Design an enzyme around this catalytic site. Structure first.
Site, PDB file in Angstrom:
ATOM      1  N   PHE A  78      38.009  45.685  47.359  1.00  0.00           N
ATOM      2  CA  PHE A  78      39.247  45.712  46.588  1.00  0.00           C
ATOM      3  C   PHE A  78      39.855  44.324  46.354  1.00  0.00           C
ATOM      4  O   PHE A  78      39.917  43.505  47.287  1.00  0.00           O
ATOM      5  CB  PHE A  78      40.266  46.571  47.346  1.00  0.00           C
ATOM      6  CG  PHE A  78      41.624  46.631  46.707  1.00  0.00           C
ATOM      7  CD1 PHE A  78      42.640  45.742  47.086  1.00  0.00           C
ATOM      8  CD2 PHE A  78      41.890  47.581  45.723  1.00  0.00           C
ATOM      9  CE1 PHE A  78      43.906  45.803  46.491  1.00  0.00           C
ATOM     10  CE2 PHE A  78      43.144  47.652  45.124  1.00  0.00           C
ATOM     11  CZ  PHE A  78      44.159  46.764  45.504  1.00  0.00           C
ATOM     12  N   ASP A 123      29.651  44.423  29.470  1.00  0.00           N
ATOM     13  CA  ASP A 123      31.003  44.803  29.063  1.00  0.00           C
ATOM     14  C   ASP A 123      32.100  43.955  29.698  1.00  0.00           C
ATOM     15  O   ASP A 123      33.119  44.471  30.177  1.00  0.00           O
ATOM     16  CB  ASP A 123      31.264  46.295  29.340  1.00  0.00           C
ATOM     17  CG  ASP A 123      32.519  46.815  28.599  1.00  0.00           C
ATOM     18  OD1 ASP A 123      32.863  46.259  27.529  1.00  0.00           O
ATOM     19  OD2 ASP A 123      33.160  47.774  29.082  1.00  0.00           O
TER      20      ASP A 123
END
Ligand SMILES: C=CCNc1nc(N)c(C(=O)c2ccncc2)s1
Length: 290
Positions: A78, A123
């Site tokens: 995270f 992407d």
């Protein structure tokens, strides 16, 4: 999942939803991506498990891949903020050049690594570049199209899509990532998206209007591409000093090489790292409000 507690929903995708979660047992805080369906293709789970080995300081660590009950979970380290949010917060003042340069340099390092291992992102966008308080920036949410492919209520942004993709190229090269990163570099500098197209043809024409409609002179083979139309309007390339002011000549030179139409002329991540623009690269820390 069950070994976790959804602290909050931190993202949405066409593929899946992303949650900030805490490992009930290890206590470690992670980002958890949930994906959809009848058995989950294996050709995917294999290219996925392979990304668990693609470890680099500038690549968000994929901790685990878990396939269960028709669901696929990807557990990632995270980070607290993404560049899209950081840019919005820095919009009135602008990100200082030394920090832009440091982020661009680190991202090129992450890409050089991926590319040397024959892995493409496909992407790249501000939303999937994650930053921390230590001045690091990391590549996240790889396109895993070779794993799955190309993608409710979640419109896919085309602003960073390389022209060869828009023109229907069957095979992507590592150059598609360099193009996307050049668009991001320009955006960090100008504080406005470089080519904000709202449709594929609009995306393509915004690129043409700025860089000139491509032809066989600058991009051999372009007129033979799948979606190339002889009827495309012919725009002259605009003066490039108009594109990213007030970026300096070293920065403009590098950007221009990241935005070459011909995927073969487009600079590689490794060569970009040697560009004069990084002669004075440093690693500043961003001021983050978490
Ligand atoms: C940007 C703040 C939330 N923290 C995150 N931390 C990580 N690691 C995130 C992701 O790996 C991610 C996954 C799927 N789509 C977008 C991002 S999101």
């Amino acid at each position: 999942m069950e070994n976790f507690q959804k602290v909050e929903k931190i993202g949405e995708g066409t593929y899946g939803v992303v949650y900030k979660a805490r490992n009930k047992l290890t206590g470690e805080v992670v980002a958890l991506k949930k994906i959809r369906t009848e058995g989950v293709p294996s050709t995917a789970i294999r290219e996925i498990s392979l990304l668990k080995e693609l470890n680099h300081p500038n690549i968000v660590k994929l901790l685990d891949v878990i396939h269960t009950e028709n669901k696929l979970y990807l557990v990632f380290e995270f980070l607290h903020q993404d560049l899209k949010k950081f840019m919005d917060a820095s919009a009135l003042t602008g990100i200082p050049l030394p920090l832009i340069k440091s982020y661009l340099f680190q991202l090129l390092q992450g890409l050089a690594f991926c590319h040397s291992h024959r892995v493409l992102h496909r992407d790249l966008k501000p939303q999937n570049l994650l930053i921390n308080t230590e001045g690091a920036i990391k590549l996240a949410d790889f396109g895993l199209a070779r794993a799955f492919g190309v993608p409710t209520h979640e419109v896919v942004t085309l602003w960073y899509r390389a022209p060869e993709i828009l023109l229907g190229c069957k095979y992507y090269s590592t150059a598609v990532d360099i193009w996307s990163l050049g668009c991001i570099f320009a955006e960090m500098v100008t504080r406005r998206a470089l080519f904000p197209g709202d449709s594929e043809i609009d995306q393509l024409f915004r690129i043409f209007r700025t860089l000139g409609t491509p032809d066989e002179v600058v991009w051999p083979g372009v007129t033979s591409m799948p979606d190339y139309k002889p009827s495309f309007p012919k725009w002259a390339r605009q003066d490039f000093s108009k594109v990213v002011p007030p970026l300096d000549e070293d920065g403009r030179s590098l950007l221009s090489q990241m935005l070459h139409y011909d995927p073969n002329k487009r600079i590689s991540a490794k060569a970009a790292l040697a560009h004069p623009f990084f002669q004075d690269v440093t690693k500043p820390v961003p001021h983050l409000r978490l």
